[PDB]
From a paper:
Ribosomes are fundamental to all forms of life on earth. Their activity is regulated via chemical modifications of the four rRNA species: 25S, 18S, 5.8S, and 5S. Here, we report the structure of a plant cytosolic ribosome and a quantitative mass spectrometry analysis of its rRNAs. The overall structure of a plant ribosome is generally conserved relative to its eukaryotic counterparts, including in regions that are responsible for the binding of mRNA and tRNAs.
For zinc finger protein eL34, whose aberrant expression in humans is associated with malignancies (Fan et al., 2017), no density corresponding to the zinc ion is found in the plant ribosome structure, and three of four cysteines that form the binding site are absent. In addition, we found a modification in the remaining cysteine 44, thus eliminating the zinc finger motif. A phylogenetic analysis showed that the structure-derived observation is conserved in Viridiplantae. This suggests a lower effect of zinc deficiency on protein synthesis in plants. Therefore, the zinc finger previously believed to be universal is absent from plant ribosomes, contributing to physiological functioning of plant metabolism at lower nutrient concentrations. For example, 2′-O-methylguanosine 1857 and 2′-O-methylcytidine 1849, together with the conserved modification 2′-O-methyladenosine 827, shape the N-terminal region of eL37 through hydrophobic interactions. This region is involved in constructing the peptide exit tunnel. In a similar way, 2′-O-methyladenosine 886 and conserved 2′-O-methylcytosine 2920 directly interact with the modified residue 3-methylhistidine 246 of uL3 through hydrogen bonding. This modification is crucial for proper pre-rRNA processing, polysome formation, and correct ribosomal function (Malecki et al., 2021). In the large subunit, most human-specific modifications are concentrated at the bottom, in proximity to the two largest ESs—ES3 and ES6.
Numbering used by the authors:
A (entry chain V): 111 to 164
B (entry chain S): 2 to 125
C (entry chain H): 3 to 48, 55 to 160, 181 to 229
D (entry chain F): 306 to 311, 317 to 361, 365 to 403
E (entry chain I): 50 to 242
F (entry chain g): 2 to 128
The structure:
RNA sequence: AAUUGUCGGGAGGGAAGCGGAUGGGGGCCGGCGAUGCGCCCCGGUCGGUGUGGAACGGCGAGCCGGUCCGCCGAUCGACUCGGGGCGUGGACCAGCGUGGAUUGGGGGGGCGGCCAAAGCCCGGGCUCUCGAUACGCCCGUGGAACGCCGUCUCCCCGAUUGUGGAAGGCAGCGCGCGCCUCCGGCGUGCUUCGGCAUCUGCGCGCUCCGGACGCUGGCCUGUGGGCUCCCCAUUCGA
RNA sequence: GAUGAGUAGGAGGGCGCGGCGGUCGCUGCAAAACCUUGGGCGCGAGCCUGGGCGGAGCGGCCGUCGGUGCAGAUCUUGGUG
């Protein structure tokens, strides 16, 4: 794949690099609004401090 | 504090000058210190470094081996930072221009008989 | 020729107008027309045997491009301002400021009649400028300068008369302000609980 | 065949020394002049009490959207999933 | 040209955020491409892994600082020296002050003060960077020649912070000084430059 | 003679480096010796102890070996050796050797006046 | 040398000595600190282009030279030679001024962001009360000022410090080289209409510009200055 | 331009003592040794010098050589608290 990419670029006189790169930062984008689910801390219950409860 | 090894200094040792006190060798070193600095020639830099070297780092070159390496290169001048010795196993000595620190008495006679020349590094 | 500076400075070293604007104001466009569409080119502005040769080559210091500037005058000090002397034989006495000499020193007078301080030079670093101002419009000291206080003991009568001429014009102004004569006749001093850093002058 | 025969510069802070800055960034002078001139106009404008860039309808929509967003910011959970603490949570 | 670009990007981000607000959605800002890392712990009692990573980051002395491009390879290295460093996202002001006041170029493995643009051109000239403004632009935007431009910069020798630190032994989240402090690295850069 | 030196002499340390415990023991002379002991607190550089000489105390190379008068000393044993300083009279001052006779000191002092060569001990043994 | 007597100085509340820093008292030091230089005339003294000789030299037969002696011409110059007049001034210390570098502190202004701040005030609609005369909800491209954060920028004060001694370089500007009524105005190109490194070359200058210069005083055989020497005291260390 | 910890240990450049081969000097107009609250130089080993004592030898520099550098060893001999 690197050989053909360089060959396709040599014919058009465009110097490129075939090196891989690690995951870089993502670009900005817009997310459409939707219903918001509110998350809050849960009141403590001692009976629930056991797999399946006491 | 700085996270380096030996304060970032080199722990390698190389010869920056000859260990010998030979006055003629020191004159040659002065000659080739100037040539290396004012020309940037790689040949001059190599010659300067080899003039610093100890005896075992300047081994002799036999005349027979000199002839084989000079075959087909009559125009070129042979340069050796060391001594040229005579070899009884070589029969035909062609005319050759050789520069060396020292020529043995037999090696000089054979080279001069064949129409060659024995040069010093100041003549080179 | 031009009567005023073309490029006023917004700050020290930065002009108000850019290079493109200055090209129009410099008139280089007009100069180009008058010289066949070219800016005229000018030309650059065109012993005794020694009696002793030093053994060691002389060394000359490198060039320094910084030039001293005239001593600045404190904003609190204006002509006719009353100053308090902080050092010397006249420490504490209140004098009248007349002008600043070319050397940067301040020219002050007692006046000599009120407190015995004659025409004298006082360094600005050793005085405090108060808020009291006495008119000195009628005082003429154009004849006084640094050379007037230069050495070359009896004080010549010429200087005594000169003191009185300057003093006389100043006494009338001082007498106009009530209690100003006594103010200039008394030395300033610090009493118990008096904090210099809180005093208003 | 020989080639032709052949001190540290005291570093100055360009953030304070104007000439040093102009040596590195000539455009800094233009930026300095524009900032000074821009400030002078604003100071003069305020003293003279000199008197919009959005359409009237657009302004109303912007206010409504921001107000709606603020309502969601301060919105609270119903706390219905905590059936054992309904009384305590009020 | 660079000055105009910086202003446009700042106003472009504001417009997009307002546009998302008007439509009732969200605008996710682009992830930071550039980090500034400062070493906050000394060189005593160094575990071997941390010691190697700090060397690869060219942080060999406390309060030394360097820029670092953001990618999964570099971020995971940084995660393994979290208690020894603090870092964040430097703004344009911070990059300018660091390069202008404490910027030194590595020329033939020697530390050379950036007194003139000739020093920048002597090394980075082949990459198109001929002036300190080009160098600033390459760093801030993480251009194609960031590796050469950034490596050309000698690690910044910062001073002890004016006003001191809170607690170097705890993470910035806990009220300490270590780890990622995001845009608050600029507040620290002011006090250390 | 006007000394050529112009930079001020800055002595990093004027006190001498006294050998540790030379005060305690008469047999231990004051000339410096590096303490080699395993527990030596001086060798280990504990504060409040005798200081050891190190290269950091080296004086400026431009002012090194300059006498307070602004010259460097050269010891002369006769009139001929004095003439060696004729061309260095702004840099080097002469000092007559301790064992020169008073008769030969008069010749040296007289010759030095003609050559404008500074003599550090010109008043020696003339009374 | 250990050790001892004596005279003199000094210290000592259950060790002494020692490191570092000053001070007091001693002792010591005139190369511990200069007095010259430049330009004038009075006198004195001593030598001066062109041709002759004496002994030599540099470059390589021939060119190119100096030294010494003598003779002419020329008529000046030199002088740790003596007087007079004018100008100028050394070592060290201190103060001040104007700036560079580093750095701490203080004061103000512009712009941007937010719920395109909130609130408050004004206008309008709704709600209608227990801490009783509310709680609050919504609206306006209304108004006057803040807040936090970010950024640009101006000014003021103090502290430490001048390493280098070859360069008027680099960079940014000003005045001339064309006219006007002169805080400004007058020509092309581009422009967001505010502006613009589009025309912006040469000459001579200036400056935050390839590392401190300037001025003034004190003192110079003194009860002065300096000190690494000596004794002792004190704070810290030990 | 960067940089500076170091026991055991390694190495380099230097200091000092006594001869020898050379070289340059000093000394009865006062050598060596020794004494000194004289002065100065060197980061330091050390060096230079004033004054005193002493009364006949001595030193610098290059090379080269060695029975060549002490606070300790219940060290040796002598002397003394
Ligand atoms: K602000
Ligand atoms: K200063
Ligand atoms: K004095
Ligand atoms: K003490
Ligand atoms: K000898
Ligand atoms: K002595
Ligand atoms: K020897
Ligand atoms: Mg260090
Ligand atoms: Mg080491
Ligand atoms: Mg630890
Ligand atoms: Mg550092
Ligand atoms: Mg503070
Ligand atoms: Mg803390
Ligand atoms: Mg820990
Ligand atoms: Mg010393
Ligand atoms: Mg131990
Ligand atoms: Mg003697
Ligand atoms: Mg005794
Ligand atoms: Mg605001
Ligand atoms: Mg200097
Ligand atoms: Mg070490
Ligand atoms: Mg000897
Ligand atoms: Mg004694
Ligand atoms: Mg010797
Ligand atoms: Mg023997
Ligand atoms: Mg032995
Ligand atoms: Mg012993
Ligand atoms: Mg031992
Ligand atoms: Mg014993
Ligand atoms: Mg015994
Ligand atoms: Mg007994």
């Amino acid at each position: 794949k690197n050989d053909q990419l360089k060959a396709d670029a040599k014919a058009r006189g465009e110097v490129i690099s075939t090196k891989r790169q690690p995951l870089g930062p993502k670009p900005g984008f817009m997310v459409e609004g939707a219903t918001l689910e509110t998350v809050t801390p849960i009141p403590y219950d001692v009976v629930n401090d056991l797999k399946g409860g006491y | 504090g700085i996270d380096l090894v030996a304060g970032g200094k080199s722990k390698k040792t190389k010869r920056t000058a000859p260990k010998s006190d030979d006055v003629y060798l020191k004159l040659l070193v002065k000659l080739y210190r100037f040539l290396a600095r004012r020309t940037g020639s790689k040949f001059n830099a190599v010659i300067l470094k080899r003039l610093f070297m100890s005896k075992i780092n300047k081994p002799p070159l036999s005349l027979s081996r000199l002839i084989t390496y000079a075959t087909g290169k009559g125009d070129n001048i042979v340069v050796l930072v060391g001594t040229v010795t005579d070899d009884v196993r070589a029969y035909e000595v062609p005319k050759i221009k050789v520069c060396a620190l020292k020529f043995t008495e037999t090696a000089r006679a054979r080279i001069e008989k064949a129409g060659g020349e024995c040069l010093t590094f100041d003549q080179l | 020729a031009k009567k005023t500076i073309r490029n006023p400075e917004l700050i020290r070293g930065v002009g108000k107008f850019s290079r493109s604007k200055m090209y129009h104001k410099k008139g280089l466009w007009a100069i180009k027309k008058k010289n066949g569409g070219k800016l005229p080119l000018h030309e650059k502005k065109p012993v005794k045997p020694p009696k002793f040769y030093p053994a060691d080559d002389v060394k000359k210091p490198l060039v320094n491009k910084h030039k001293p500037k005239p001593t600045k005058l404190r904003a609190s000090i204006t002509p006719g301002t009353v100053l308090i002397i902080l050092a010397g034989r006249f420490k504490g006495k209140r004098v009248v400021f007349l002008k600043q000499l070319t050397s940067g020193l301040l020219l002050v007078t007692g006046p000599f009649k009120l407190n015995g301080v004659p025409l004298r030079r006082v360094n600005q670093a050793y005085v405090i400028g108060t808020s009291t101002k006495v008119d000195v419009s009628g005082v003429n000291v154009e004849k006084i300068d640094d050379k007037y206080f230069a050495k070359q003991n009896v004080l010549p009568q010429e200087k005594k008369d000169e003191q009185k001429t300057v003093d006389s014009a100043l006494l009338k102004a001082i007498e106009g302000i009530p209690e100003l004569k006594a103010y200039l006749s008394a030395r300033f001093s610090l009493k118990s609980g008096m904090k210099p850093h809180e005093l208003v002058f | 065949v020989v080639r032709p025969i052949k001190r540290a510069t005291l570093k100055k802070n360009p953030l304070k020394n104007l000439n040093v800055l102009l040596k590195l960034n000539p455009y800094a002078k233009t930026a300095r002049r524009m900032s000074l001139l821009a400030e002078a106009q604003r100071v003069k404008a305020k003293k003279e009490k000199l008197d919009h860039a959005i359409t009237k309808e657009e302004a109303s929509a912007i206010k409504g959207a921001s107000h709606s967003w603020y309502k969601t910011m301060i919105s609270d959970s119903d706390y219905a999933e905590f059936d054992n603490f309904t009384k305590w949570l009020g | 040209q660079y000055a105009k670009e910086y202003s446009e990007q700042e106003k472009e981000l504001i417009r997009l955020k307002r546009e998302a607000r008007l439509k009732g959605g969200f605008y996710v800002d682009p992830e930071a491409k550039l980090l500034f890392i400062i070493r906050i712990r000394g060189i005593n009692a160094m575990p071997p892994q941390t010691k190697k990573i700090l060397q690869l980051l060219r942080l060999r002395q406390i309060f030394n600082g360097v820029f670092l491009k953001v990618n999964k390879a570099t971020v995971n290295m940084l995660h393994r020296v979290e208690p020894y460093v603090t870092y964040g996202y430097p703004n344009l002001k911070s990059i300018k002050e660091l390069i202008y006041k404490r910027g030194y170029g590595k020329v033939d493995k020697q530390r050379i003060a950036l007194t003139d643009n000739a020093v920048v051109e002597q090394v980075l000239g082949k990459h198109g960077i001929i002036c300190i403004e080009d160098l600033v632009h390459e760093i801030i935007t993480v251009g194609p020649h960031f590796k050469e431009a950034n490596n050309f910069l000698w690690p910044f020798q910062l001073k002890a912070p004016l006003g001191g630190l809170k607690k170097k032994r705890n993470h910035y989240v806990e009220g300490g000084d270590a780890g990622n402090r995001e845009n608050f690295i600029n507040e620290l850069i002011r006090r250390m430059n | 003679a006007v000394p050529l030196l112009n930079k001020k002499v800055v002595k990093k340390r004027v006190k001498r480096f006294i050998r540790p415990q030379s005060d305690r023991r008469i047999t231990v002379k004051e000339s410096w010796r590096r303490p080699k002991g395993i527990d030596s607190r001086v060798r280990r550089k504990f504060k409040g102890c005798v200081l050891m000489p190190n290269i950091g105390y080296g004086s400026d190379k431009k002012t090194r070996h300059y006498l307070p008068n602004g010259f460097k000393k050269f010891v002369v044993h006769n009139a001929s050796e004095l003439e060696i300083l004729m061309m260095h009279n702004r840099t080097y001052c002469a000092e007559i050797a301790h064992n020169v006779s008073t008769r030969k000191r008069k010749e040296i002092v007289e010759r030095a006046a003609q050559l404008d060569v500074v003599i550090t001990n010109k008043l020696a043994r003339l009374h």
